[PDB]
Design a protein around this ligand. Structure first.
Ligand SMILES: *[C@@H]1O[C@H](CO)[C@@H](O[C@@H]2O[C@H](CO)[C@@H](O[C@@H]3O[C@H](CO)[C@@H](O)[C@H](O)[C@@H]3O)[C@H](O)[C@H]2NC(C)=O)[C@H](O)[C@H]1NC(C)=O
Lengths: 121, 174, 88
């Protein structure tokens, strides 16, 4: 089976880092991305990184969140900076070749459990 | 008449093509778009594909401002090679061709306000990595990536002339 | 911008491409970097492999030192024809 574990904090007053480790398959040639889902059932694209190390970001989090990939470890990391109370949501790690996509969740075949993030002021 | 040749001769006076426009005081903004005349064959043996494109960029160079009855100025290729143009290259290109038959297939227009429009006809072979797990039921997303070779994000930034969806137009027969 | 222009003109003017940096002094130390874009085609018939790469070379040249401009002067590529580069 292919699994995408997530690691990182869940509470912050802040700066945070959420890592994603993939097991069961090598995603060197696949596109690895992060998605966000706030309460209300709407999934939002955040960032994606390609085999060519090219970083795509969503407008809402451009310049705030940074995406990187460790191809040797087959993992993808997202550094979150400038958090706000409205950023509370569940963050999902995704992988898969982006067909008709690169900004749509339908183009990704692999997803992880997700990690909760809350910010209090 | 004499006005054309005079303006042409006097544009390059003191022009240094080794320096980009607005060097050290702003970021050179390049508006780019593409007309794909034909999406060439896709060679899954080589994991590559050919594409024929009218690739046209545009930017602003206040060093090349001028005044005259004419609002548009066409530059011959000898003079077009004497000024700064973006060093755009294709990241996933393998062996691209700039067409030269019968004369270099490129054009350079200058507006009186210093806006340069630079059009080229290219045939680009580009890498298309493929996941052939589901062959022959598989589908792929072949990329075409380009950008400046030498100038970083803080010096040259590329943008699409129109909305990004409408800035890459594929011909109906192409 | 004219300050950068005159600085560049000073650097290139009176520059001898034939002489390496520290031509009579110690040897010039050249560092190298490679970014492998792709290894395309490994042939067992022809005994070769195709390799696309970004090949970078770094070296000190006191003749091209400049001051008063805090930025790194990335220049038009044609200036490579005017400067000394290694015979790598
Ligand atoms: C012009 O070029 C110089 C030299 O390439 C640039 O300076 C350098 O800046 C980079 C990025 O900040 C440094 O890389 C890093 O090393 C530090 C070491 O502590 C590390 O903490 C960083 O995470 C990063 O890996 C590089 O070492 C540094 N080299 C120097 C100062 O000799 C400079 O930024 C360029 N731009 C300008 C405007 O000068």
């Amino acid at each position: 089976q292919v699994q995408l574990q997530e690691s990182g904090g869940g509470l912050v007053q802040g700066s945070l880092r959420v890592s994603c480790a993939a097991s069961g398959r090598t995603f060197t040639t696949y596109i690895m991305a992060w998605f966000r889902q706030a309460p209300g059932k709407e999934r939002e694209f955040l960032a994606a990184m390609d085999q060519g190390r090219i970083q795509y970001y969503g407008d809402s989090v451009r310049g705030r969140f940074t995406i990187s990939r460790d191809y040797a470890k087959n993992s993808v990391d997202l550094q979150l900076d400038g958090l706000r109370p409205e950023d509370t949501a569940v963050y999902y790690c995704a992988a898969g070749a982006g067909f008709w996509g690169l900004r749509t969740a339908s183009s990704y075949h692999y997803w992880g459990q997700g990690t909760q993030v809350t910010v209090s002021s | 008449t004499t006005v054309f040749t005079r303006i042409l001769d006097r544009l390059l006076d003191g022009y240094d093509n080794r320096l980009r426009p607005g060097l050290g005081e702003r970021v050179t903004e390049v508006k780019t778009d593409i007309f794909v005349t034909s999406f060439g064959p896709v060679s899954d043996h080589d994991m590559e594909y050919t594409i024929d494109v009218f690739f046209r960029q545009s930017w602003k160079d206040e060093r090349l401002k001028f005044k005259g009855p004419m609002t548009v100025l066409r530059l011959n290729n000898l003079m077009a090679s004497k000024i700064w143009t973006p060093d755009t290259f294709f990241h996933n290109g393998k062996k691209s061709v700039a067409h030269n038959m019968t004369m270099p297939n490129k054009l350079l227009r200058i507006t009186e306000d210093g806006t340069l429009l630079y059009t080229m006809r290219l045939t680009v072979r580009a890498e298309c990595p493929m996941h052939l797990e589901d062959f022959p039921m598989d589908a792929h997303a072949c990329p075409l990536k380009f950008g400046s070779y030498a100038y970083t994000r803080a010096e040259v930034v590329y943008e699409w002339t129109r909305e990004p969806a409408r800035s890459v137009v594929v011909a109906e027969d192409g | 911008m004219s300050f950068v222009k005159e600085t560049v003109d000073k650097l290139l003017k009176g520059y001898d491409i034939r002489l390496r940096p520290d031509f009579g002094g110690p040897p010039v130390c050249v560092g190298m970097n490679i970014d492998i874009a792709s290894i395309d085609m490994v042939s067992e018939v022809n005994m070769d492999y195709t390799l696309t790469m970004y090949f970078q070379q770094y070296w000190r040249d006191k003749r091209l030192a400049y001051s008063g401009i805090p930025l790194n002067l990335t220049l038009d590529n044609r200036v490579a024809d005017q400067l000394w580069v290694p015979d790598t």
